[PDB]
Design a protein around this ligand. Sequence first.
Ligand code: ZN
Ligand code: ZN
Ligand code: ZN
Ligand code: ZN
Ligand code: ZN
Lengths: 217, 217
Amino acid sequence: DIQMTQSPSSLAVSPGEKVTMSCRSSQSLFNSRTRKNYLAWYQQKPGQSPTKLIYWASTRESGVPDRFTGSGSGTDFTLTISSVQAEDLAIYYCKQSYDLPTFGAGTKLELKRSDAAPTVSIFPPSSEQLTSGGASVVCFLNNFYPKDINVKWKIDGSERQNGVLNSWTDQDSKDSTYSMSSTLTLTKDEYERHNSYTCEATHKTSTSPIVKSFNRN
Amino acid sequence: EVMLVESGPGLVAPSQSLSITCTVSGFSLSDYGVSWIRQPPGKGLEWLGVIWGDGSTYYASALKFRLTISKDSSKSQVFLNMHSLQTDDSAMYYCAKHTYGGPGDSWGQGTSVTVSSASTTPPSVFPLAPGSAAQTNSMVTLGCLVKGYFPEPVTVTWNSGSLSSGVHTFPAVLQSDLYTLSSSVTVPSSPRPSETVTCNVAHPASSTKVDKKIVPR
Ligand SMILES: [Zn+2]
Ligand SMILES: [Zn+2]
Ligand SMILES: [Zn+2]
Ligand SMILES: [Zn+2]
Ligand SMILES: [Zn+2]
């Protein structure tokens, strides 16, 4: 069996720059008969299905821009993007076709931009969710950067740790930012015993964390 | 033109059979080969097998006698069949039009398949409307909380799609056998409440759909 080791795992770059990723096959993928190397590179943008960029180690597919360039022979190959643009945000995979197709672990290309503070919104549980015994308080942190941001929930001034679920959207390939959802799940019972509900978004972008909150009454 | 659409169950119990149909358009299955690739939740691509033009089939050694590929030229469909299912088989399944070596390689949108004992359950849709009188501004973010469903995925759009700018739909987080997701939309204060804002939730595994108009607190 052929094993494809890819690298780097993840790459961060600024629009206009150039990067390269390598794919090393456990054995030669060079076919003496057709004088070809059976290796292709695939691009998978957030939420879409993979698209082959290059076949036979260095042949751009129909419609792929010139900035994408693959090379190598035998066991070592690499992919290069001249000037990484925004729409290039995706995960790149290499596929060998010398024997029973095998895929690389993939290369995650991310974009780098300037710090951006999140736009925070807090939402108390809805009337209709209450009627079912549940009580979710939702907090949205939109369009921020960098990714690593923390969210602390405070019930009546006390930091609650239980019942919080967090979600990060893939990187937006338009403004290069992220967004995340924070949900504090409680029972209607405990929700109606307390009054002050707050969401704190401490991030690099600011020494004082962005705060938003409300009170049931 | 080429078109590949896969149709599958969505939820299948362990130790049960799995059948996925790939309907093709714009080409003959006798001239091109059709392979199956899978991708576990947040992981790399795994080539499963291929059905060639002359009819020959090849499979990945991993799932040796568990997977089978066949096709009906009359029906213009290819089928992936798997038995002795494992929860690891839970993944997004794709069929792709391929050739020996060269241009053409075009994938389908793929279908999500989860192997589990959990019983499929529809989502509850709660509206996330602003504090009422806590913060007026030019921008206003509304939300839609989708909780308690199984399996993935769920679909959310705002105003049947007419509103796709400034939308953030977060990935689902498994919350004890059930899934929870939320979507936010930011719009100008001129539109809401003036013009209407509704989120539309679709859960195909449960053949359900919910429209929830966001009304002022
Ligand atoms: Zn955004
Ligand atoms: Zn308490
Ligand atoms: Zn043959
Ligand atoms: Zn068997
Ligand atoms: Zn037939």
